[PDB]
Ligand binder design. Sequence first.
Ligand SMILES: COc1cc(O)c2c(=O)c(O)c(-c3ccc(O)c(O)c3)oc2c1
Length: 238
Amino acid sequence: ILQHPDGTVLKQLQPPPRGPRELEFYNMVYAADCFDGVLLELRKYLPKYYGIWSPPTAPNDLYLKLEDVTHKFNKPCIMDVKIGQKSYDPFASSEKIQQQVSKYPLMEEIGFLVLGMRVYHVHSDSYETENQHYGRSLTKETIKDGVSRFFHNGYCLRKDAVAASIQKIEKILQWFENQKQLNFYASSLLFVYEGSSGGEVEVRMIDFAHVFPSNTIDEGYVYGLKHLISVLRSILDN
Ligand SMILES: COc1cc(O)c2c(=O)c(O)c(-c3ccc(O)c(O)c3)oc2c1
């Protein structure tokens, strides 16, 4: 993900079929002639999309030009959380389903997975980062404390950012409770708050290489959001 100074990032398309599917998702949602109310409302929760991009001398090399959701922050604290009970799509082979469930076998039980975090610590004027193995190590016994770490700045728990995150997730949940036309697999929520207020908190949906047409509620995604809200809610009692 290449960061441009003008507040928009360039996300390289994943290899096929994943990159192409993510391009068609953004194109569908941000279609200039779209008047589907479900899709127009969905735009509120995604990074703004500026179209396909490639370097002038390299039309082979495909990127999505997207809003940098951290741009308005001075010391952004960033957490990426995968949502859903299944991290594989409805058309995966048995081998791939097994590979995806083995990556984190608690996905069905918990409904979400912390992919990484970058947290600003006030006393040291520095960041502490957690990679993919942090969230994959969390169980039902340790998910609450695992999530809490994102909101602890070295001297206090940022309950303002926790409460704001609940309020922003709730609008996303309401969108999912009022649509029956898309199911989202291996998609995420990007959380951002100000490390240096309630407070600039940004919560945005990202990662759309496995979004499919459907006739039903995305039950796995709803389950994940609800459980994530419940965990964040319990953190307010710390
Ligand atoms: C579909 O994918 C997207 C779309 C986006 O719009 C952003 C985005 O805006 C962003 O800041 C980041 C990001 C930047 C720096 C980090 O350290 C980090 O963990 C995430 O990832 C994105 C991914």
